[PDB]
Structure 1
Amino acid sequence: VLLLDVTPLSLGIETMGGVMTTLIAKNTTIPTKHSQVFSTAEDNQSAVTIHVLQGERKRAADNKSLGQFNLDGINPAPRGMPQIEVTFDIDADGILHVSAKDKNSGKEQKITIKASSGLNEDEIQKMVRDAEANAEADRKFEELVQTRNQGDHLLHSTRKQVEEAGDKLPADDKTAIESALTALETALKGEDKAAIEAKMQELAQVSQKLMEIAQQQH
């Protein structure tokens, strides 16, 4: 072959924290079909938004929006339990089909995105240069979003563990932990990675009795 139809830019979705998560890497030959399974960020979340992105930046807001759609009818569950399969399918014609399926309900929604959508040539080239100009800023954002999500995990898992602990947790421990949880909830609102790590650390330092209780319960 003298030509190869390839994707000029990565294609993916926005995940928690406003980061692009790639489903089809830049320079993939089409036709192609990839899937990954995602979950909910909150207890009892009833719907997710699938926001389809084109580009090479880590920040979702810095990539091109191809469209978005909602999947609802997610059944009441703890965060992280539902399995929402997202598939990106680019056919022989260069049409992208994105679907999200809830593996519990079997409910599914799709967006179809015409071959002509997204960034034109000049934007594509600016994009490839921008990811490269900003590799460091993007790395730092990726590490911040990671820390923030780990903090959110710790926040929510700890609160759950205090509730299952009940009386097993001493008064002093529970005061220390809940002060720390408030401070971490606040730091999760900022963009200061060290501050989040500082509150996580404080929570790790005050929660040792709680962790023992939680481990012993199961």
Structure 2
Amino acid sequence: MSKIIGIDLGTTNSCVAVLEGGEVKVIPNPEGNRTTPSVVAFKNGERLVGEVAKRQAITNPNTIISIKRHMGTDYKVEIEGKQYTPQEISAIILQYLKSYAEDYLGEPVTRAVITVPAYFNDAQRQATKDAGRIAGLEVERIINEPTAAALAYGLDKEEDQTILVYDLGGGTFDVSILELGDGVFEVKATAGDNHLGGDDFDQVIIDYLVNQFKQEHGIDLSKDKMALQRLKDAAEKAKKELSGVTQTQISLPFISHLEMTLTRAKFEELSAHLVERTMGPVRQALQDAGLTPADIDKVILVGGSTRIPAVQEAIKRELGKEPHKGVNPDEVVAIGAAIQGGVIAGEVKDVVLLDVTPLSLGIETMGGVFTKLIERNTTIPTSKSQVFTTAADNQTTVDIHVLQGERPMAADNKSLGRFQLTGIPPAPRGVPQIEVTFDIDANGIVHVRAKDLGTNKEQSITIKSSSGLSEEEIQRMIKEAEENAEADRKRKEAAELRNEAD
């Protein structure tokens, strides 16, 4: 069949994502971009879309810029050769997103699902399923951005609860307060700002910057756009640094040159003003629902520019606790769209347990030198097989001794099995083949086979405990291999290839 593919459009924030196996996945675009964005164009006989449409936008008649404002509206653009509607333009947004998810996977997604606003209603949120199928990719449902990343993470193990989201758009802010219906999502409250965000942040950097340069040399900045580009970029840098890092600087030099030591608390007192343009939307929610800041079970951080400690130092002292950061917020809508995408048309209830292997398992070479087949950490329902040969010419029989641990030595390891095998045909050493499939089930009793080839006479063993014991005892040994740190001196028996006599 087909997997149900996420596509969010966030008006300058947009993604089409998927799920392969047991791990949630954020697709790559045709551009080197982890995500290519929402706006486009046209020309004679040939369309141009994305980050490739958008810089032919200040250079050519056709650019559409953040059409989110016209979804569910009677808005009609007059454009060359036919006027156009939000639907037919978005049909191409997702026609291009279709070819791109296709040129990534190869296993097509016809069925797909969308990320809309929590505020939207019968008019526009229908416009989503509709234009969703305009490009050709059917919609099996339409999520809302907020209930979406809520279920990217997911709330349904847990109990009847309450929450408020954080949407940070591309220069838009939002938050939507939600509750649990013990399996049901209904978004309760809505708030935010029409223009506020990351680019604005970059422009407070560019602003105090340019103003300070007119403060020194008297010479003004904004007249110059490779300089100002230089600004946007380097200032974006200093930004996300101030987020993570404790100190900064910016090397912008050979300007025309500004080399500054970029500060954090100056950028903070720079930015600590619009953090209360948020507390407004937030508490306006707190009243739209009626329940105080103290009424909620969990709350979250979303968006692109949300990665700085500004809002989070405004919150830890606002609502009492820390946010769930367990995402990579930037794309966090996309994957969310497909979570249930694969909860519907696909996999059901999931243990995903005994996904790890106690130790590296191997056996008795050259009088005890221990070689691994199984490593540690390995998903348990598996088996690996290897074939040795003759110790010495005419081995009439071969005993098998297997170890568990790391240290490449015999009693420097745990004796696991000892059992033997006889009747081998007499003949030069190294030649005859004996196989051992370590056959490891899921449940923990391990089977292990050794059998000649030319014989097809076979002895195997079914062990019992494999462990029988506790965590500390093992990890004390996992420690022990490290602790020894070169008992590797047994390369001494590695030169015992003296065994070769010729």
Aligned-partner Cα distance in 2 for 1:110–1:117 = 19
Counterpart position of 1:144: 492
Aligned-partner Cα distance in 2 for 1:56–1:44 = 32
Aligned-partner Cα distance in 2 for 1:70–1:87 = 15
Aligned-partner Cα distance in 2 for 1:57–1:93 = 26
Q: Do residues 55 (structure 1) and 401 (structure 2) align?
A: no
Aligned-partner Cα distance in 2 for 1:146–1:100 = 25
Counterpart position of 1:75: 425
8 Å contact from structure 1 (residues 57, 63) kept in 2: yes
Aligned-partner Cα distance in 1 for 2:468–2:396 = 30
Mark the CA change 1:118 to 1:48 in structure 2 (over 3 Å): closer, same or farther: farther
CA-to-aligned-CA distance 1:79-120 (integer Å, 9 cap, x gap): 111111111011122221111010010010011112454654
Identical positions, percent = 67
SS in 2 for 1:151: helix
Q: Do residues 39 (structure 1) and 386 (structure 2) align?
A: no
SS in 1 for 2:403: strand
Q: How does 1:168-187 map to 2 (within 5 A)?
A: none
SS in 2 for 1:62: coil
Aligned-partner Cα distance in 1 for 2:466–2:366 = 28
Q: Do residues 103 (structure 1) and 450 (structure 2) align?
A: no
Aligned-partner Cα distance in 1 for 2:416–2:461 = 9
Of 427, 430, 439 in structure 2, the residue corresponding to residue 89 of structure 1 is 439
8 Å contact from structure 2 (residues 446, 466) kept in 1: no
8 Å contact from structure 2 (residues 374, 384) kept in 1: yes
In terms of mean alpha carbon deviation, does 109-118 or 93-102 score higher? 109-118
Mark the CA change 1:71 to 1:120 in structure 2 (over 3 Å): closer, same or farther: farther
Aligned-partner Cα distance in 2 for 1:11–1:40 = 21
8 Å contact from structure 1 (residues 40, 82) kept in 2: yes
Counterpart position of 1:64: 414
Aligned-partner Cα distance in 2 for 1:18–1:24 = 17
**Which residue identity lines up with residue 108 of structure 1 in the other structure?**
E
Counterpart position of 1:161: none
More helix by share: 1
Q: Do residues 22 (structure 1) and 372 (structure 2) align?
A: yes
RMSD, aligned α-carbons: 1.7
SS in 2 for 1:17: helix
Aligned-partner Cα distance in 2 for 1:46–1:114 = 29
8 Å contact from structure 2 (residues 364, 403) kept in 1: yes
Structure number with higher relative contact order (C-alpha < 8 Å, ≥ 6 residues apart):
1
Aligned residues: 152
Q: Do residues 130 (structure 1) and 480 (structure 2) align?
A: yes
Q: How does 1:188-199 map to 2 (within 5 A)?
A: none
Quote the offset at 1:42 in angstroms: 1.2
8 Å contact from structure 1 (residues 65, 118) kept in 2: no
> Could you say which structure has the larger radius of gyration?
2
